[PDB]
Amino acid sequence: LGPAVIASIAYMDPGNFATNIEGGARYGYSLLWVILAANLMAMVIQNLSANLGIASGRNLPELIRERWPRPLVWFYWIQAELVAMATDLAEFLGAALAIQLLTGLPMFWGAVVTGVVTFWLLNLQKRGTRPLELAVGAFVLMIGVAYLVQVVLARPDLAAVGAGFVPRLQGPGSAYLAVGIIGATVMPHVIYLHSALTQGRIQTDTTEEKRRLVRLNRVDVIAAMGLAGLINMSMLAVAAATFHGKNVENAGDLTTAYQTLTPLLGPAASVLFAVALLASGLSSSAVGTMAGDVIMQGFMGFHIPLWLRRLITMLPAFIVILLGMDPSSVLILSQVILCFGVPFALVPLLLFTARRDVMGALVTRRSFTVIGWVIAVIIIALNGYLLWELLGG
Template sequence: MKRTENIKHSDSLSEVHQSVDTSKRTGWKRILSFIGPAYLVSVGYMDPGNWATDIAGGSKFGYQLIWILLMSNLIALLLQSLSARLGIVRGLDLAQASRNAYPKWVNIPLFALAQTAIVACDLAEIIGMAIGLNLLFGLPLIWGISITIFDTVLLLFLLNKGMRKMEAFIVSMVFIVGLSFLVEMFIVEPSLKEIIKGFEPSMLSGDALYIAIGIIGATVMPHNLYLHSSLVQTRKFERDSKGIKEAIKFNFIDTAVALNLAFFVNAAILILAAAAFFKNGLHEVAEIQDAHKLLQNIFGNVAPALFAIALIAAGQSSTVTGTLAGQIIMEGHLKLRIQPWLRRLITRLLAIIPAFFTLLFFGDDALGGLLILSQVVLSLQLGFAVIPLIHFTSDKKTMMGFAIKPWVKVLAWLSSLVIVALNVKLVIEEISSWGADGGWYIYTIIVPLAILIGLLLVFIFIYPFIKKSRADHDNVPHGNALNIEEIEKIHYLRIGITVDFSKNDRNTIRHALIQGGKDAHYYLIHVVETAVARYHGNSAMDHETQSDAKNLEKYCNNLEELGYSSTAHIGYGGTVTAIVEISNKNKLELLVMGAHGHKGLKDLILGTTVNSVRHKVTIPVLIVR
């Protein structure tokens, strides 16, 4: 069944929904058309949070923890493939599915937790970017953090260029990271025999267990599960059984290749730390800056430069995908949609403020602790994404024959148990260490909050078992279609026309006259925006005001000659406010506005009058281009 245009706008990431057509391609081209979503997801598996845990593991325990990286990667592969399956089969992202499955009140804390996780993730990207710029160009960390706000412009540019261009940017960033570490492998010359031995599982205790928990916690990120379930919907394919099965297969290939690349990068960081630091007796290297400095001491300038370039690339690519995940979560849980640049700016500011004040009051050395804190916050949210995902993909009714097999379900629940248990352990240890300082806020705020979050996690797990599914109509984004009965002609008698004395006016006026004919009265509206008009209002008599008044009078005389009744109305100062005031004062029944068709950066500079006006008036608005 074909979907209407009206419903399409409620789809996950509707700007790029089904924007990549796979149906017209064959052979390898068809497989390649599905490649992309998992690469956007994979950058979250190689962000600065991963770097910190990998460096600490490699410097302290050599190659011993490579098997932990492999296990984390296999768990990630399983969960990301479930996320892709949900998006392909149900056409819903994880946030939308959660809104349909859980009570309305649950979605508010779910959104709050997911948004907090994205801010925490963004915090890690900001710190990584700032450290990378500092290492490469000597830029002070506080300046590096401040200028990261400008990547909002980069995101806006990429969104306007379409999904394929964004994927190409991310893949190129991932390629830079991978290539940088490949070259570094040749420089540090690790022991191949010891690397192979590192894949052998071993008993962990003490610091090794703690770092292993950190590696797993930093590897599987909650926002990636939301992101992947949405990104797979950018591919257009036949919605029959064969098409869905093929899409699941090709997306699994995409996921496997991308996450193996992420595994290579993480393993390369750990191996680099083992070969460069552990081998040379430097067992306490946990800070990214220390790793860079030691690389310079041991191997000269090339290795540390590549290290810094890779760090910047990883941070920049992760920040783009974090914004997309934020948009998905807000639209899915709350049905609230705002401009991507605005939500990017809000998320970035929420992340910049703690980083900025940490540097200001505690100095550069405190950033490492802030990075660890961001990973703890991420770990808190993980269960709220993993548990619903397994529930949704196990449901035979909603998955229409594509529910996961029992053995996959067992593996998924075991994986979630390992992740949640280890992350809970990490959180308890962190809270205990904070409690040792004796702060009153630990027992009055942090502990009660952690208990409430824990109870919510239990509810999220139990609820789908006791209430299998909510009413089907919950899945309809805008409600059900109404019966269209006999239509009576609408006669507009008071029509407003906004004019700006450009070549577009003729077309705008023509459309307005068609709507009302000679029975209606027309209100020609123009707003003077000079500094004098903004300050003095209707008492302004500057040259532009006088010129505009004469032009409006010409339009009125011209319409009178043609047999139409009209009056001129001049507004002053803010365009939107003035148009709305004139519309309300004259009790207009229809407003006809001309649109210039500018978008992207021009919208930010010139403003979006039409869009703002239509939200503030209660009458129909006809937009003429």
């Protein structure tokens, strides 16, 4: 399958559902340009991260640990852990919410059931992961194809669709959801993990052999990112055609998101959406847990036991549940926090991929490094404009 698949399941976590449905319901098609821009940003960034592991032989947390001063390494590890908890917050609550959509249990008992499954998910082997990892990939992909079909059948207003690709914002609320979309697509925890997925996969330590893996990875990433982008744009366009302007109660909330596929799936739309949300949440929550321990091992050299890390990341989920906070609102919030961790992940990535002592003959072309720094400035400005609107005028 490759690393572009383990990536792709992270681009369809409950965080993507929350930002797509809410974005289409609240702002129509006006944010389609964000999904396209963020998806093209991820293509460049994930290619740089993948080329870092192939060329250097180490992941990004390892290179920071071995090259940068100890206090800066500590800071970069702390912020990476905050990114890891925010990542798991959306994925754990997304699965717990899907439990409520399927069984009607309260969110607390949905999290208890989610907690037992995730702890049983760590005690897994390749012969046991294969039927479960293939099944969740089937459920999520089929729902994705359902939105590609539904966007055609829903007859979206093409004039509004076309205008939505023109970069425009509509107050602070549109910036909040746009930053959430960027964080949901350009995920910092995948930035650190993608370099670890490609670091050891080499049959002959040769520049010729390394270039092939770079070329083969570039095709697999762009093909995977193109498909994920079409699905995300379809899901936002279908939610826009379904809720935007209709003045429906709790429009954009994940409790009613199944109504986007009701004209296609009929009565099965509720179960098929909740099953997909559950398979998307359980699989991503295990992927992020495996990524967080790899991130800490790379930064600190050591790691806490896997059961303790799984226990710590559950606490913000139960706190949010006990606080009565709306799950769909905190899934979007977590994606916004993730987008604030993107610039930190990009600075070492852009510096390391431009060095010959790190990359060897595979130094990034000067143009793609410039494009990477432009993406870093755009995201810093977007995060700055958002923090500006949230604190003052």
